[PDB]
Amino acid sequence: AMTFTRYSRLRVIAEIRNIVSSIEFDRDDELFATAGVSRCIKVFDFSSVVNEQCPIVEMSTRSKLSCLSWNKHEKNHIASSDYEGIVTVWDVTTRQSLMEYEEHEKRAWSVDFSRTEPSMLVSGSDDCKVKVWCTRQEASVINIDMKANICCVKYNPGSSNYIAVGSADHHIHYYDLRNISQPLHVFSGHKKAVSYVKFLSNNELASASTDSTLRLWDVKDNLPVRTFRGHTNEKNFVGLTVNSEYLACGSETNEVYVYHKEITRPVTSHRFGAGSYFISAVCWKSDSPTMLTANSQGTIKVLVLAA
């Protein structure tokens, strides 16, 4: 619950030396994948990266990628969302696109595979729609017409009935997919678009916004909890990743920031290393102090919180 006193720094344990828009671990934290403007989904072996730097899979795409989400049951399956609006499910062993969902009419910023109903995935787009898909069906299962651009959609980790939707309207819309006529709750507090939403647990939701804050919310009792400050994020998608205790995000200062969920100012930060670069993607290795990070130059680092 309170391990932050153990840590003062992030150590670099590996570096792979354009923009990486997304970096994500597979179901077992064995492989990770990167994707971005270069139209190539690259899969790396985490253990090889730490011990040694060539990807073990490279899948070319039709469009720049905005987001990746690995399937939580089918080890080899990974979804992507791209700038043409296409949501694709890939098999990293065969390299084939298994599904190409094409209903979005503008760039899709986000895709997320459900942890608990692993054939379900959700996407959000500049077309102001949230779409829920099932890997066994070609047509969307659920469509939510919203009023503003959707930057991020994330399933609750304990139930596929709930999604958090981060909107350009500055709010987080929390839906029960069993009745989409109204969200369960809409969380106001951010002053700019909500670029990411991520759950620490079934009841704890975090968000990032281009108001240079992260925020923590209680989705059991629909309460604001805490606002986190220190990083610079006024313009770009700079990444958000959370686990049971920690939030990490990028910064337009080319720094990674780590917050403990109980403390509003950073536990630590790391300068990536003249130029205006930004951190563009982050991903914890589950509840451990290890994290993947990447920036707008395409550099990837494996970092670990340390004393």
């Binding site: 403007v37 500049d126 503003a148 651009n149 909107s167 350009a168 678009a193 313009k235 998608f237």
Partner: peptide
């Protein structure tokens, strides 16, 4: 610019 977050200010 490609990773700029959208801004919305309509109805």
């Amino acid at each position: 610019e490609i990773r700029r977050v959208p801004e919305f200010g309509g109805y």
